[PDB]
Design a protein around this ligand. Structure first.
Ligand code: PLM
Ligand code: PLM
Lengths: 238, 56, 270, 256, 270, 125, 60, 60, 83, 56, 56
């Protein structure tokens, strides 16, 4: 009898622990593997896939398709703000239900570079330009285009090619950021300003629409798995 | 018939042994990192180049 | 495994246009932040480890529980095995169409006295039995029925005060993987049961007291915990939105896309 | 000289040429193929109709209107009444297939619009009421497109499917459907779109009538908007080509 | 590791002056006792081991405890994680501005009967659950709420009579180290909460009974114990003087420098 | 594959992409640069803000009408109220700079018009 | 089953003991170190630093 | 005393488990084997043997 | 241990008759499905392991039980050993 | 005096040791696969060929 | 994959092994003695000599 001493932590059941256990059905025979297209080895390969962003949450439109559409209309003056939303991919209502939004909510910490892909769905003849700005925190969301200039902005132009890519770089004083809302690490702001008013021929429709996309670059990473507040329950399902 | 591997650090070895006769009794494999995004991003037949326009 | 490096870049003037692409190709642009701005050489030691499937699906979870007593109407508890009777586990498996893994079961059993006028109640250590019945096997209708002899069926005898019992099970499916979503009927006439309910026959799980244990009534509580291992996955998909309703089918109650906020310009949630 | 806007596809007899399009999204990256003998199960020798099966079909074109919610088809049973692929479906207990979907909607330069062509493996639709399940007649129709409904479906005692678009019938966010393979028909820079789907299923072969493993969905995000005087009626047309079909277990004629 | 040797010295007459220096340079003189007197060669085997940081910070310590009962108003106990709600541990960490280490948690749980008139009380073995909730996660408002399923969140099931449970946690901070002292606000307007309270969001810790366990009421006691390991430190500072007051801030009540004594010449304390 | 219609310019943070344009007229043929030490005068060490300065700015857009005669800006004092280049202008007695001007006016295919963008060194009115 | 005998001292919790315990969050990722001025490896390096002495304690 | 920690699953009795146990009658002597015709090493060798089929179940 | 492979076969016309035999010999025909029809080459990875005697007879089983009390008539339980 | 063998898989080694002095204390042997159907099927003196008629 | 080191004595070896896959599970390191007082005492730019006057 090899002498031995139990240590604190015996006869406990830990949720995340790693241990070996005796099999309940010895020498069971396993069916062979098959080659199934689309094998995921890691969740990060989901986080790089594009997804639509319900940029317009206003009012009761969240029950219709119009939640995904951004109105763009010819004005009589330039410098009006197209839209804007805060960057809090796990908290802010914008990204909340997105694809990237779901995967984050399981994780507490993250860092990387979020790409925003925009695509102009308007009429083929109408053209236009736009100013996509990103203002790091330290001041409120800029309320005038002249103020949006001093951020990091990509002047983007409609034309033969359609899609655009605004790559939000990674600027923070820490390595990671809370996915849950906190004022300490708060992310920043994003705006879109008319660079030059939409020009439309005659007989072509005045108003257009612009859809937004979200993806994570190849430097993206997450940490510290947790529960997701979204899904509810009452009593066991039947 | 032991085996040796590396822990998870940031800035070592551990000795593991399988005690049972059934594969399903072995401990979980946490360390497989292999990743190939090409099966979701870039699912096109004609390979596209970043530095060039998409539709030419 | 490690994050990729962000390579530095100076200014640029040139006809090559990284910042433009066409998403109509269904092709996510690979552009990295060094393309649209100036960037300094930076080494990243961040690791993607904890995002792997294994660490994502592997945590113990409480799928279900029952109550069975020491006397009266219900002397044993019976449950068919489906993961879908618990919300938060079922959702974690609905990302992946086809999943493959080896369950690791752990039970947690507790006892509770019940109010009664019985005099001179003196406890003794209870003993719980947990029996698994693969499909088609005999089904006990009474606690003393012969089936509890378990000439074959894997069974576990447990005692209060000891550690919680644990057993591991290998991959039991017929096909090459479990199927979370199945579109079709069970009958060639496209009639009968629709949905995944047809694929799932896992057998049944039972439990009982071995001995009365005292004069006074005693109610017990059992809890099951899955811990998937060796996981493989295929064909990811969108997470579920609307709250669950039934365990046999995907039926849902229509609900909005997201939460709301004030006018588009407004920068804060409401 | 060359162009990336133009593509020509040839299978069997039929051929489809398009002078404005994008590349061809291929599956998850697995080009469809026959069955290697490592994974085989059925010990009968499989039939390989090849040209008799592999070719393009054209279903009924469906109108597209400003309010039109969208549409869905079920591939394993759509073609069932068309061609030998409909015949070779009824006489076999097993089949293995992969699909090339080609959607064609064109418009002039003055028509705004955007469509979403996704191909969803194993789309499982809910029911109107919570207790029942959809009837086999509602989820399917021969060669005919079933369409969504823009507003919630009142829940009676019927078997009707839940047709709300924003839940896409599966109770998920419609904005997220792009994880599956897809392409964007966009009246600006595009004309037609294309998808190639390899065979996806839990088991190496399957019965065709029981289990519909691949669902096709076309959902407009930005409705059709055009000034008056331009032509009103713009149809959408779908083209569906099986690839590398195989069959086993010849039996009598019917499904029951 | 060993003490340095004291080297012998004979008499001295010379213009080199070890015994003099200038402290205005902020430079502690290195003079050793052999300089100002005659000294014999002596070997010292004393070791500085037990003065290392590791042995200094590593001891288990009771940070906090709660009370939760088996019935009535309070059926579970909730606590946010801060070291600063216990005096003697908090002081040991206030030497060092920036600390880095890996916690090792150990819980000690005890049960106590409560006075009641209930008849025929017969105990059964209780089972305690301890659940950790990283920040932002769902918060249970009732004992039977779905959140206790712990589909993800690390949770521990424990039983009376067994050994005290133990689990180790790695370094959880966002930055390159924990921060004991932080001067600044949480808001760019220099408003809102001031002090270290802003940096600290560790999540929350919960506990409950799994089963009622008896008819009569039972109150339980849980205790947490930190045991830092692998410690690293930076930028030492003066120990705290005045008694603590609040756990969120450094606020103090002004108190004298030291104790007192009689006239300077007096050689004994009073 | 390539095109001469398209151009992408990147300085510091900002970036300007245009899918329809012509080539970039460069000065008189001298690409802008720092000051070689042969011609230097000031003996203090010069500040080189680089990214803090070099980047694109966007002034107020001005309407263009059928009768609109034209416009002029003065570069050395325009930016003076914008960004660090406005700040680093007020705190120094000397500066040396060169300008990249990018003018953006788009219209549909049905709009006639022609503009003239000239950059005139030392225009004395 | 390798035969074994518990010894006195099992199932006890000692304050100063040294033992290994299973990690509660497997494969967690640790942020890299930084180089911070003034790294203390030992308390003795505090004990050599000068400090003022309240030599006059008289009265108030 | 080699330090050790029990894991969940101790002191349980599993029906199908594989473990070693101490013999109750040490050094017992086993009678030698005999060569008996018809040694089954596997049940599959039963499953290949013909058997009659009650094809007619009608009535009594 | 592994299942045997099913070897492929083309058509056949020949005087060798696999499909016929005589069971009166008390001899189970060894005919494999490739003989009476056309067959594709197939590898089987199925294993016969769990059908071995060892896994068949080895499971714990409850043969019997008794009741004996702490006082009164029956203070002990006796049982002869038969399965 | 350990020993090494292979687990049961489908698409590894385990270390076992015998701790007792009695054969009946050793663990069960689950792995013996040897099979020879000839002792039930084909119990005839004259070996019969599949490809030929039974009674000639 | 064991390791050997020395105990703490005054006037021997112990065998330790890491059983877990996570660095934070390894036992504490009590033995690191490295010390360099120069980072608190003597924090001056001009190195000063004991044997000489401070301010010359
Ligand atoms: C005492 C032995 C207990 C054995 C426990 C057996 C439990 C089987 C678990 C099956 C797992 C998850 C499968 C979902 C099935 C399906 O929908 O196809
Ligand atoms: C059941 C799992 C329990 C997990 C216990 C997690 C406890 C976290 C401990 C954080 C440690 C000391 C930090 C002070 C924080 C700060 O002020 O920045």
């Amino acid at each position: 009898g090899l002498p031995t001493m139990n240590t604190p932590g015996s006869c406990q059941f830990l949720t995340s622990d790693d241990f070996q256990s005796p099999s309940a059905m010895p020498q069971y025979d396993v069916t062979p593997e098959m080659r199934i297209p689309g094998e995921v080895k890691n969740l990060m390969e989901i986080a790089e896939v594009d997804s639509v962003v319900p940029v317009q949450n206003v009012g009761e439109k969240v029950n219709s398709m119009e939640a995904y559409q951004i109105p763009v209309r010819s004005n009589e003056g330039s410098g009006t703000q197209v839209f804007g939303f805060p960057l809090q991919p796990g908290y802010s209502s914008v990204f909340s239900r997105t694809l990237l939004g779901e995967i984050l909510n399981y994780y507490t910490h993250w860092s990387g570079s979020i790409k925003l892909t925009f695509m102009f769905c308007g009429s083929a003849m109408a053209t236009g330009k736009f100013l996509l700005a990103y203002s790091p925190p330290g001041a409120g969301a800029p309320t005038k285009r002249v103020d949006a200039m001093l951020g990091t902005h990509v002047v983007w132009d409609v034309g033969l090619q359609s899609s655009c890519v605004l790559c939000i770089p990674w600027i923070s004083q820490t390595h990671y950021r809370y996915v849950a809302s906190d004022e300490y690490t708060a992310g920043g702001f994003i705006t879109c300003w008319y660079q030059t008013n939409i020009v439309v021929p005659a007989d072509a429709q005045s108003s257009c629409y612009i859809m937004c996309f979200v993806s994570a670059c190849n430097d993206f990473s997450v940490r510290l798995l947790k529960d997701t507040p979204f899904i509810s329950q009452e009593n066991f399902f039947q | 018939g032991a085996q040796v591997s590396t822990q998870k650090t940031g800035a070592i070895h551990y000795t593991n042994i399988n005690y049972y006769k059934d594969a399903a009794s072995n401990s979980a494999n946490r360390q497989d990192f292999t990743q190939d995004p090409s099966k979701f991003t870039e699912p096109v037949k004609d390979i596209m180049i970043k530095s060039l326009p998409a539709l030419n | 495994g490690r994050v990729a490096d962000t390579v530095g870049t100076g200014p640029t003037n040139s006809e090559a246009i990284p910042a433009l692409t066409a998403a109509e190709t269904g092709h996510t642009s690979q552009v990295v932040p060094s393309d649209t701005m100036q960037t300094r050489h930076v080494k990243n030691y961040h690791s993607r480890s904890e995002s792997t499937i294994e660490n994502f699906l592997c945590r113990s979870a409480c799928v279900y529980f029952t109550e069975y007593e020491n006397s009266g109407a219900k002397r044993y508890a019976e449950w068919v095995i489906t993961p879908r009777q618990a919300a938060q586990l079922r959702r974690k498996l609905e990302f992946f169409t086809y999943v493959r893994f080896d369950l690791e079961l752990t039970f947690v059993i507790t006892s509770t006295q019940q109010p009664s006028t019985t005099q001179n109640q003196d406890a003794q250590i209870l003993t719980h039995q947990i029996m698994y019945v693969p499909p088609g096997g005999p089904v006990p209708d009474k606690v003393d029925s012969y089936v509890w002899q378990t000439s074959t069926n894997p069974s576990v005898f447990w005692t209060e005060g000891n550690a919680p019992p644990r057993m591991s099970v290998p991959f039991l499916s017929i096909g090459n993987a479990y199927s979370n979503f199945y579109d079709g009927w069970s009958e060639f006439s496209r009639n009968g049961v629709y949905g995944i309910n047809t694929l799932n026959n896992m057998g049944t799980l039972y439990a009982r007291h071995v001995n009365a244990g005292s004069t006074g009534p005693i109610k017990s509580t059992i809890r099951i915990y899955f811990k998937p291992k060796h996981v493989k996955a295929w064909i990811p998909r969108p997470p579920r939105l609307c709250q669950y309703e039934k365990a046999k089918n995907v039926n849902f109650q229509p609900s909005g896309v997201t939460t709301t906020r004030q006018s588009i310009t407004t920068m804060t949630n409401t | 000289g060359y162009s990336d806007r133009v593509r020509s596809i040839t299978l069997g007899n039929s051929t489809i040429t398009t002078q404005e399009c994008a590349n061809v999204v291929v599956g998850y990256g697995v080009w469809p193929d026959y069955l290697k003998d490592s994974e085989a199960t059925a010990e009968d020798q499989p039939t390989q109709p090849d040209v008799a099966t592999c070719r393009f079909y054209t279903l009924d074109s469906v109108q597209w209107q400003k309010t039109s919610p969208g549409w869905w088809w079920k591939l394993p049973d759509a073609l069932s009444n068309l061609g030998l692929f409909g015949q070779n479906m009824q006489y076999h207990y097993l089949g293995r297939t992969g699909y090339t979907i080609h959607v064609q909607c064109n418009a002039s330069k003055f028509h705004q619009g955007c469509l979403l062509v996704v191909c969803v493996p194993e789309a499982e639709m809910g029911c109107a009421t919570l207790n029942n399940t959809p009837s086999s007649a509602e989820l399917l129709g021969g060669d005919t497109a079933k369409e969504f409904a823009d507003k919630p479906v009142a829940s009676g005692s019927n078997k009707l499917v839940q047709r709300v678009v924003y839940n896409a019938g599966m109770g998920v966010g419609v904005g997220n459907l792009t994880i599956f393979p897809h392409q964007w028909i966009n009246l600006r820079t595009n004309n037609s779109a294309t998808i190639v789907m390899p065979y996806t299923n839990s088991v190496p072969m399957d019965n065709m009538f029981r289990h519909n493993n691949v669902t096709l969905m076309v959902i407009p995000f930005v409705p059709l908007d055009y000034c008056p005087g331009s032509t009103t009626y713009v149809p959408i047309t779908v083209t569906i080509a099986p690839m590398c079909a195989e069959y086993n277990g010849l039996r009598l004629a019917g499904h029951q």
